[PDB]
């Protein structure tokens, strides 16, 4: 029935040397690249979970150019009445379905590689056939829509809040001059847009830590860099305020921003404040935290407790709230890296190497959890000048990260030296330190 090895590479029988399954549509555990492509375009049934997971994770084991060459060759299949009807036509329609999902959900590969797109359009444009016309036409319209695209409140959003800095006075914008409510809202819109922009393939096979990270993971990198710039800027605001009374005002203002992040269910923001508060230069400031009111200390402790016991309280709090929210991104990076490190790239059976597909699938299920929260818009107005201020945060300046964190700790040792005495430092703020609070204006 199926073709011989001398004419087709996709029709060798299944064995423990080329394809292994998990414990109805079977679920592939590991297999050769040829075996994966074959099951990806299996003539017996439709497999949307495998199609979706394969196109998200394939870059970890196959190059885009190689995948196109293999699916084109899988399509080219050389009793002839039933051979075309039950084997050639179903496989060719499965190949076209794979091209459709590929161009629709992963167009960035055709954007990054112009020659890849040239080959894909050449392949689709040469198909012809009877039932393939409708397939060639939907695929063509998707490539058209993607090429063109590359080239709203449900209710009244609250009034934008201002404090010392008047609107448009961008040169005075700072932690204590902007309104703490507006800082949290504007940072939540910025973080919400960053969260929503991340694609699942940016998180596969640790590509964001490899040589071509800027191309493969630009949205993920933007998200981690925002977290680093915000957390380090909060710490810099704290240790660079040498006067103790003014430093209490600064730390206390950051706690107020975290409370507005909690009202907004921006967990990403909450844990960036907790991260700055737990950092080595800030966490050891006993004289500063002694002055922080009890209610405010309790708010910071309950925020920390979300992380405790492998984020037990965070995971329970996240699944109980209603939209909108901004989930804590770091836990996904943590669980994905644990998966990448604790599972082997390949499985060996009978001296043969099989790609570990279950490893990729476990990583793809974590990215699916990410995606379930990417359609939650906030009923908040953007303030372009405040958004720009946070987008342009550069606490590190022209320094390496380690050199700047070393400086932050040394500043902490300077402002709060035991048994060395506690020096008094002059005031740096020439405006009122009192917060306008976190209650909106009705
Ligand atoms: O006391 S916690 O539960 N809360 C925090 C967050 C936090 C950081 C800095 C100061 C404070 C404050 F309560 F004094 F304001 C709280 N970090 C911890 C780190 C390790 C163990 C226990 C905790």
284: tokens are: 């050891």
The method of structure determination was X-ray
CATH code at position 337: 1.20.870.10
Query: Which domain range does residue 349 map to?
Result: 1-147+330-372
Same domain, 362 and 258: no
- Among 315, 338, 372, the domain-final residue is 372
What is the 302 CA–ligand 1 centroid distance (Å)? 9
Q: From 239, 250, 301, 309, give the residue whose CB has the most ligand 1 atoms within 8 Å, as the site to mutate.
A: 301
Kindly state whether residues 212 and 302 are assigned to the same domain. yes
CA of 285 to the centre of ligand 1 (A): 11
SS3 letters for the chain? Answer: CCCCCCCCCCCCCCCCCCEEECCCCCCEEEECHHHHHHHHCCCCCCCHHHHHHHHHHHHHCCCHHHHHHHHHHHHCCCCHHHHHHHHHHHHHHHHHHHHHHHHHHCCHHHHHCHHHHHHHHHHHHCCCCCCHHHHHHHHHHHHHHHHHHHCCCCCCCCCCCCCCCCCCCHHHCCCCCCCHHHHHHHHHHHHHHHHHHCCHHHHCCCHHHCCCHHHHCHHHHHHHHHHHHHHHHHHHHHHCCCCHHHHHHHHHHHHHHHHHHHHHCEHHHHHHHHHHHHCHHHHCCHHHHHHCCHHHHHHHHHHHCCCHHHHHHHHHHHHHCCCCCECCCHHHHHHHHHHHHHCCCEEEECCEEEEEHHHHHHHHHHHHHHHCCCCCCCCCCCCHHHHHHHHCCCCCCCCCHHHHHHHHHHHHHHHCCCCCCCCCCCCCCCCCCCCCCCCCCC
Q: How many degrees, rounded to 5, is the angle at CA 165 between CA 159 and CA 169?
A: 100
| Residue 153 resides in a domain | no
Q: Count the domains in the chain.
A: 2
Ligand 1 center to residue 2 CA distance, Å?
66
- Asked if 66 and 8 sit in the same domain, the reply is yes
Nearest ligand 1 atom to the CA of 305 is 3
For residue 101, being part of any structural domain is answered with yes
Please report whether residue 84 resides in a domain.
yes
Looking from the CA of residue 278, the nearest atom of ligand 1 is 8
* One domain, residues 303 and 336: no
Q: Which atom of ligand 1 is nearest to the CA of 296?
A: 15
Domain boundary among the residues 321, 349, 372 is at 372
Report if residue 351 sits inside a domain.
yes
From ligand 1's centre to the CA of 423, what distance in Å? 25
Ligand 1 centroid to 162 CA: how many Å? 30
The CA 278 to ligand 1 mean position distance, Å, reads 7
- Final resolution, Å: 1.9
Tell me the best of 283, 294, 303, 412 to mutate to test the pocket of ligand 1, counting ligand atoms within 8 Å of each CB and taking the most: 283
| CATH code assigned at 252 | 1.10.840.10
Co-location of 262 and 398 in the same domain: yes
CA of 305 to the centre of ligand 1 (A): 9
Pocket of ligand 1 (CB under 6 A): 274, 277-278, 283, 289, 292, 297, 300-301, 304-305
Residues 322 and 337 both lie in one domain: no
For residue 90, is it within any domain? yes
Do 245 and 122 have their domain in common? no
**Residue 242 and residue 134 share a domain:** no
């Amino acid at each position: 029935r199926l073709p011989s090895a001398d004419v087709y590479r996709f029709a060798e029988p299944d064995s423990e040397e080329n394809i292994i399954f998990e414990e109805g549509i079977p679920i592939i555990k590991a297999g050769t690249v040829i075996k994966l492509i074959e099951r990806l375009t299996y003539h017996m049934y439709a497999d949307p979970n495998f199609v979706r997971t394969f196109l998200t994770t394939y870059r970890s084991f196959c190059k885009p150019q190689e995948l196109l060459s293999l699916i084109i060759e899988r399509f080219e299949i050389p009793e002839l009445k039933r051979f075309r009807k039950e084997y050639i036509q179903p496989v060719q329609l499965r190949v076209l379905n794979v091209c459709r999902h590929w161009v629709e959900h992963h167009f960035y590969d055709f954007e990054r590689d112009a020659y890849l797109l040239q080959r894909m359009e050449e392949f689709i444009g040469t198909v012809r056939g009877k039932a393939m016309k409708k397939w060639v036409e939907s695929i063509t319209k998707i490539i058209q829509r993607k090429k063109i695209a590359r080239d709203t409140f449900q209710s009244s959003p609250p009034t934008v809040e201002w404090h010392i800095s008047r609107p448009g006075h961008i040169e005075t914008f700072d932690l204590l001059t902007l309104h703490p409510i507006e800082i949290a809202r504007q940072l939540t819109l910025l973080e919400s847009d960053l969260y929503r922009a991340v694609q699942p393939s940016e998180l596969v096979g640790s590509v964001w830590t490899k040589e071509d990270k800027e191309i493969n993971s630009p949205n993920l990198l933007k998200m981690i860099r925002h977290t680093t710039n915000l957390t380090l800027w909060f710490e810099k605001c704290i240790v660079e305020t040498e006067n103790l009374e003014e430093r209490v005002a600064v730390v206390s203002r950051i706690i107020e921003i975290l409370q507005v992040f909690q009202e907004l269910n921006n967990f990403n923001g909450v844990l960036e404040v907790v991260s700055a508060m737990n950092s080595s230069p800030v966490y050891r400031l006993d004289h500063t935290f002694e002055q922080i009111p009890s209610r405010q200390k309790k708010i910071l402790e309950e925020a920390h407790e979300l992380s405790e016991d492998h984020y037990k309280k965070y995971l329970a709090k996240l699944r109980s709230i209603n939209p909108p929210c901004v989930p804590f991104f770091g836990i996904y990076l943590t669980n994905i890296l644990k998966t990448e490190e604790g599972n082997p790239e390949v499985l060996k059976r009978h001296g043969k190497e099989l790609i570990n597909f279950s490893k990729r699938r476990k990583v793809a299920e974590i990215t699916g959890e990410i995606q379930q929260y990417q359609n939650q818009p906030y009923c908040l107005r953007v303030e372009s000048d405040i958004k720009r201020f946070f987008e342009n945060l550069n606490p590190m300046g022209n320094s390496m990260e380690k050199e700047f964190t070393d400086y932050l700790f040394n500043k902490s040792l300077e402002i709060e030296p035991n048994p060395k005495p506690l020096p008094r430092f002059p005031k740096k703020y020439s405006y009122p330190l009192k917060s306008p609070g976190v209650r909106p204006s009705n």
